Amino acid sequence: MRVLMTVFANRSHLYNMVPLAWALTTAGHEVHIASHPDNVQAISDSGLTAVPVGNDLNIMAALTLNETRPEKLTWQYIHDVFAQYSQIYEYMADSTMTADLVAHARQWQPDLVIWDALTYAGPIAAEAVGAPHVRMLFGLDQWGRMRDHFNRLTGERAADDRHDPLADWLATKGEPHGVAFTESLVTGTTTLAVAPPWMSFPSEQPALSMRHLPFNGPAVLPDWLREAPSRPRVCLTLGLTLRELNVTLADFVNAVADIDADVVATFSAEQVAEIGDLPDNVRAVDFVPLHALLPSCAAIVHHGGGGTRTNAIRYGVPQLIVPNWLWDEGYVAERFAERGAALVTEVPDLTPDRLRDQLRRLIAEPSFKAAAEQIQKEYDALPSLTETVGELVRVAERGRS
Amino acid sequence: MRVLMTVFANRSHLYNMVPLAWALTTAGHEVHIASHPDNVQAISDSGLTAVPVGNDLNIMAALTLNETRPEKLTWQYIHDVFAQYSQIYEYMADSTMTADLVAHARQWQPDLVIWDALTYAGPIAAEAVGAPHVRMLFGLDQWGRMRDHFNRLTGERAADDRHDPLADWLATKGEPHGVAFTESLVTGTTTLAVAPPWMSFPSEQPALSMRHLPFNGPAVLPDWLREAPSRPRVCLTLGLTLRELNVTLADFVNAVADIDADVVATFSAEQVAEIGDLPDNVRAVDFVPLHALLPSCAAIVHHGGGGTRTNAIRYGVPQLIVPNWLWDEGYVAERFAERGAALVTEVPDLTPDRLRDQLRRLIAEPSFKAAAEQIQKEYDALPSLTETVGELVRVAER
Numbered sequence A: 001m002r003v004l005m006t007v008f009a010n011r012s013h014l015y016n017m018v019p020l021a022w023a024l025t026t027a028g029h030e031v032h033i034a035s036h037p038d039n040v041q042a043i044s045d046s047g048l049t050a051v052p053v054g055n056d057l058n059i060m061a062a063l064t065l066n067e068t069r070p071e072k073l074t075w076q077y078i079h080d081v082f083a084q085y086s087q088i089y090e091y092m093a094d095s096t097m098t099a100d101l102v103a104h105a106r107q108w109q110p111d112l113v114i115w116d117a118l119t120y121a122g123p124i125a126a127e128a129v130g131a132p133h134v135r136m137l138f139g140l141d142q143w144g145r146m147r148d149h150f151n152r153l154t155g156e157r158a159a160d161d162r163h164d165p166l167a168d169w170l171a172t173k174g175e176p177h178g179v180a181f182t183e184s185l186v187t188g189t190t191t192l193a194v195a196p197p198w199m200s201f202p203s204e205q206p207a208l209s210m211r212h213l214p215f216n217g218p219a220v221l222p223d224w225l226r227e228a229p230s231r232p233r234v235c236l237t238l239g240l241t242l243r244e245l246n247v248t249l250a251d252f253v254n255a256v257a258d259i260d261a262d263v264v265a266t267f268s269a270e271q272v273a274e275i276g277d278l279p280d281n282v283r284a285v286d287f288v289p290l291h292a293l294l295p296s297c298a299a300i301v302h303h304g305g306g307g308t309r310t311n312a313i314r315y316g317v318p319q320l321i322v323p324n325w326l327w328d329e330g331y332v333a334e335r336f337a338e339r340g341a342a343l344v345t346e347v348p349d350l351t352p353d354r355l356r357d358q359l360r361r362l363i364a365e366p367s368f369k370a371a372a373e374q375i376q377k378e379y380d381a382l383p384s385l386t387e388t389v390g391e392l393v394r395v396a397e398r399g400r401s
Numbered sequence B: 001m002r003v004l005m006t007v008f009a010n011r012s013h014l015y016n017m018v019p020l021a022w023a024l025t026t027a028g029h030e031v032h033i034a035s036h037p038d039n040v041q042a043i044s045d046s047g048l049t050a051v052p053v054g055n056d057l058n059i060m061a062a063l064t065l066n067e068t069r070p071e072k073l074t075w076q077y078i079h080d081v082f083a084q085y086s087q088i089y090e091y092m093a094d095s096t097m098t099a100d101l102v103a104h105a106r107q108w109q110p111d112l113v114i115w116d117a118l119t120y121a122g123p124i125a126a127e128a129v130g131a132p133h134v135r136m137l138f139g140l141d142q143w144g145r146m147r148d149h150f151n152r153l154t155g156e157r158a159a160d161d162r163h164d165p166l167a168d169w170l171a172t173k174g175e176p177h178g179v180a181f182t183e184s185l186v187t188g189t190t191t192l193a194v195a196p197p198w199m200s201f202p203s204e205q206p207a208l209s210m211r212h213l214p215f216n217g218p219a220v221l222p223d224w225l226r227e228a229p230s231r232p233r234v235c236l237t238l239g240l241t242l243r244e245l246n247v248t249l250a251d252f253v254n255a256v257a258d259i260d261a262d263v264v265a266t267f268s269a270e271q272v273a274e275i276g277d278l279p280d281n282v283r284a285v286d287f288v289p290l291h292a293l294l295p296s297c298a299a300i301v302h303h304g305g306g307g308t309r310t311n312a313i314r315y316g317v318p319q320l321i322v323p324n325w326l327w328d329e330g331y332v333a334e335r336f337a338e339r340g341a342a343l344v345t346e347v348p349d350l351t352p353d354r355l356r357d358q359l360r361r362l363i364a365e366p367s368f369k370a371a372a373e374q375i376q377k378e379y380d381a382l383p384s385l386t387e388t389v390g391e392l393v394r395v396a397e398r
Ligand SMILES: [Mg+2]
Pocket: B334
């Protein structure tokens, strides 16, 4: 079958769907990855077929989606979140991008559209051709969680009092292509999850789950990784968060290194300068392939994003999470902490001493390792990518007459 | 499981094994590709994890393997073929390359080694750690074909006259790593085939067969390709052949184009300029991904190589083949021809006129498309890459 996969130009959201693209490819299907022209090189570097759509995105040059306090989750708040993000997401998948993707769907006529959850050209293109479409998550389903609340609230207001910014947005987006607003434009014929069911939000809709494979991008094994591990290793990838905060970057690095293990730390040229002389047991590296590193690590310290935490899940590695707030990191961090698999320090509570002490516990108390391994066992038992391709074929077949 | 794949530094031979590497990957196995340092970038640019081994290879800078006449296939001929190719293959996977891949295997403990069929460091590394290994073909098994004859012809020699250049070479190759010679060093614990059984040589050993996925590196669909075609499209990939060959490139281009169809031709910039003004119905291009062009094509003209022909099989496209005779192109073109799915023009016989006339046949006689489509049917029945991953698990378990 022909699968049209679409993702806005962002390498992380691309890598999120690379293993699924390739599972579909090696089972025999023809897979096109459609994205803005600036994502073409990344699609190439992943071994896949790029179909450029729209103009370069260049996405790099009050109302949040991670809000979970019940009192803040009013109809008016979620309404306004929807109004704002409807604009942002439009920007991220253009009328040009959307027209190019519809034109390709009409020409190629795919049997399944799989769209990155932030890429709303996906469902417009799919519906121009009655292909069933799968909304692919890239962490927890914040948008579906808010959408469920919103639709529950809406169905109990007066009828004249149910403005829906998503309906106005997506009816508008679909209009030039004869695509009518349905609710399935918002959340997909169905949704594919990348996070394990035990940490996901309850949904009023079903979600396929999957033993998510964390694609780390092109990789060359360095010599130093090739050598028999000397003694316990810890992986430190908190570079970005650390520059943010009289208490110095060197101070943070000296404390974090003061533990019974070798540290592999990812740092800029900028940061390696800013921190000056490194401790003895620290190797600074601008990038490391986690799947080559993590099998030998007693801990990983990181900002709680999906790619890195899926690697700690897959390799059974305890975590020290300093959550960022780009998507779901705070909420997932607490889920791991509750299972005994992680220790958390919020950004506002960050001291060198606090990180070191947490790291020392992860290293010393084997309960964290056991909990991380238990997590790994339950992940290994999720449906394989081959099983998932089998579900996706049932979606495209069940989606046909 | 851990799978150590290895291939000498040639992109085509890497590409041969990329979709398998990725089948293995998405099934959850840990996959390393070991190749000389000058091939590490192509490995990482196909999305996989490279392990550099050995020194840069730089491969670009009467005794043939493809000899099939039985009057020529004497023990002495085959003996001398094995004496000459063992030197060539030793060169392509060094005592340094072999020592680095052995040391990596010792440390990483792969469960299974898969080695490109020209990459003889593989079985040494595999035997050094006692892991089983699969020899992965990149076309027909010329070497297996010759070895079958040789081993039999050797059997009937006086014991004192049974000199085996392959046993000598691989014995020497393994000895620093404590690997004694055994015939599994020559042909693998088992062999994985990429060509369909219908075009294959008879082998004394079974090979796993496979519904081969052709990969050719970066692939971007150009915009000119999103229109429905408005009549037969032809794909012309003979730039290299016409280059090494009164008649001007423009003579060829002009005749090949003299048909009722649109030609898409891959030509260097140097070639486009010195072929001069192009006919209306020809579009010169650097490269085009074949797997996206061929669905709309009535014919492909090519040199009969493994990746392009696997594409022709997969999309059921009739072929005009002008064989290279590098590895197996001559034998394979004849097989395609005998099935009614291709017409063949040997290089000594190549003239703008012949290309032209064969090209019209392919477009206008429905028997060729029908035969191309039967081939595709049969390809569709071969074991999926998923099945193949299951067979390779069994191999690793035994
Ligand atoms: Mg014959």
